Amino acid sequence: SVPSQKTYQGSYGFRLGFLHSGTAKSVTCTYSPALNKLFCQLAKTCPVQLWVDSTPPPGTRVRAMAIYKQSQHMTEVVRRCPHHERCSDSDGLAPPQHLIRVEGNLRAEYLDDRNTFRHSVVVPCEPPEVGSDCTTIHYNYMCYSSCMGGMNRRPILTIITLEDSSGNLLGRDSFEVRVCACPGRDRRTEEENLR
C-alpha cells in the first residue's frame, strides 16, 4: 500500500515551516517553496518547523516517513542502499537501514511496520522553547538520492504526520527531498527549469 500524502491541517491547524537558507554553493540544507522541495547534503542537519493554531493534547506525536514520488515506484519501500546500511554510522538508536533520522532527541522511536515494512521515525510533539513561536525538529537523510541499489536517482517525498497517542491521524504535510552534494546549485537549477 501507499501512505496518504494529502495535506491536512486538522483541528490544530498543523503545517510545516522551513528556514530561508539561500542557495550559496556552500549551503548544506535549503528549501524551495516554488518546488515544495528540500535539498540537503548527506547526513546534514535539516531543520523542519512545526506550526499549529492551537496546542495539541499531551501524548501527541510527530512521525516522518519517506515514499517514492513516482507512482510506478510509490509501492516500493524507501530504504538505505546496500553500502550505507552497512557503514556502521549508527547513532545508537536508528536502525542502520532507515533513511530518515531525528537528530538529538533521546525520545525518538524508530518503527519497522510489521505489515507494510515501511520505516518511520516518531517523536513526541513538544511546545516551543520560551520565546519561540514554533517547534523545530532536526532531521538527517542518510543516503544520496543517487545511491545505487537504494533510491537510485528516484525522487522521494517525506510525509510528516501529527498523530494522537494511539497513532490516529491529526494532521499531515509533505515535501519532496533531494539529497545531493550541492543543494544550493541544484535548487537554483531546478527552480530555473520550473520557470
Is residue 119 part of an annotated ligand binding site? no
Is residue 29 part of an annotated ligand binding site? no
Q: Which amino acid is at 107?
A: R
Is residue 143 part of an annotated ligand binding site? yes
**Candidate ranges 40-48, 67-75, 123-131, 140-148; the one touching ligand UL7 (CB under 6 A):** 123-131
Residue 177 interacts with ligand UL7 (CB under 6 A): yes or no: no
Give the integer Cα–Cα distance in Å for 114 and 112.
Answer: 6
Smallest separation (angstroms) from ligand UL7 to the CB of 132 = 8
Is residue 81 part of an annotated ligand binding site? yes
Smallest separation (angstroms) from ligand UL7 to the CB of 128 = 5
Give the integer Cα–Cα distance in Å for 161 and 175.
Answer: 12
* x-marked contacts with ligand UL7 along 46-65 as a string, rule CB under 6 A: ----xxxxxxx---------
Grid cell for residue 50:
512545526
Contacts 24+ apart (CB under 8 A), 16-20: 16/48, 16/49, 16/50, 16/51, 16/160, 16/173, 16/175, 17/48, 17/49, 17/50, 17/51, 17/134, 18/47, 18/48, 18/49, 18/175, 19/47, 19/49
Smallest separation (angstroms) from ligand UL7 to the CB of 6 = 21
Smallest separation (angstroms) from Zn ion to the CB of 124 = 29
Q: Is 72 helix (H, G, I), strand (E, B) or coil?
A: helix
**The one among 100, 147, 156, 170 contacting Zn ion by CB under 5 A:** 147
Is residue 64 within 8 A of residue 139, CB to CB? The reply is: yes
* Site of interaction with ligand UL7 (CB under 6 A): 50-56, 125-128, 134-135
Please enumerate, by residue number, every residue annotated as part of a binding site for Zn(2+). 81, 84, 143, 147
